[PDB]
């Protein structure tokens, strides 16, 4: 009985080693491990015969549905196409922003003007919207 238990503990210790070198020493992109809310810093303390982990996590609530586009392009120049970085292009619903489209974060809703910091240039595609007038990145 002792030999069996000793083996299972050794395997369990290997799992603990991996979590310390991933979930404690770094933010993790995996999902899976830790609490089910992305990952943000985790901590570890001693417990009898083992380690006790605590994982801080992020839980979304109050989801809303909005209109969004795959990307944007200049109607006057079909080779200028952009797509959002780490976020989405949404139809604006904000009184502060005169622009027809706005940028938001992928974990939290909040509109912002579209600027070159939030975009990347991409090859053109049929689903991109054609903008007849005002786009700041490129201005032309």
């Amino acid at each position, epitope marked *: 009985q002792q030999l069996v238990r000793s083996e299972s503990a050794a395997l369990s210790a290997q799992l603990a080693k991996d979590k310390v070198n991933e979930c404690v020493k770094a933010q993790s992109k995996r999902s899976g491990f830790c609490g089910q809310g992305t990952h943000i810093v985790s901590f570890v303390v001693n417990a009898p015969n083992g380690l006790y982990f605590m994982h801080v996590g992020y839980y979304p609530s109050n989801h809303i549905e909005v*209109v969004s586009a795959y990307g944007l392009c200049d109607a006057a120049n079909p080779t200028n196409c952009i797509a959002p970085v780490n976020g989405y292009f949404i139809k604006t619903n904000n*009184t*502060r*922003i*005169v*622009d027809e489209w706005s940028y938001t974060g992928s974990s939290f809703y909040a509109p912002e*003007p579209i600027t070159s910091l939030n975009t990347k240039y991409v090859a053109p595609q049929v689903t991109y919207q054609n903008i007849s007038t*005002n786009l700041p990145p490129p201005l032309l």
Partner: antibody
Amino acid sequence: QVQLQQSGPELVRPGVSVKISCKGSGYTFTDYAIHWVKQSHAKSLEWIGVFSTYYGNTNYNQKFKGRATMTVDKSSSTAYMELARLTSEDSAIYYCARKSYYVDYVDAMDYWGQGTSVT
Amino acid sequence: DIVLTQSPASLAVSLGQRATISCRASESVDNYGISFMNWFQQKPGQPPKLLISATSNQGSGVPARFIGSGSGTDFSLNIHPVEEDDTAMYFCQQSKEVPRTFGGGTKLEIK
């Protein structure tokens, strides 16, 4: 208790640039775009432009792009419009207005200033 | 921009009579089913006032008395209880695209 105060009317001579102002009251001025409209007749009204009061971004009616500009005095809670090169065809009642969304994704003119006029 | 027109150029009705306004668009205003249509009211000596939006026949500053209707290129305004304080110029508005032009309007009158 929202209000849109405005500058007095004037009989300005042609070729003179004209500055018009509208001051918001009873709300935070920086959270709403200002809209401007021109009226020459009970049946003749047209959009002039829109100005964000937080970012300074604008859009204008194509006919005024070479003549009109807009500014904001954030400490006076006021917006301004200036129109270069006045002519008799510009006599109108001018109106500032506050942007809103009563319906999702539909711009609405909301409250309007009482108007001012230039001739 | 979409040209908007309206008819009849003026309408006269008896008090408490139902009344309507027809409004046509040169091109549809629906984009993603949003509609983007606003109606306004104006009287002499004052600025225009918002009445309705295509999904708001109450709210947006009015009683349920002002009913917007239609889709695509065709729209209308419907008031079952007209009163003498409803005499006003009325205007269809395009919010879908810049310049954001709008109709010259029509005038309601009490006979």
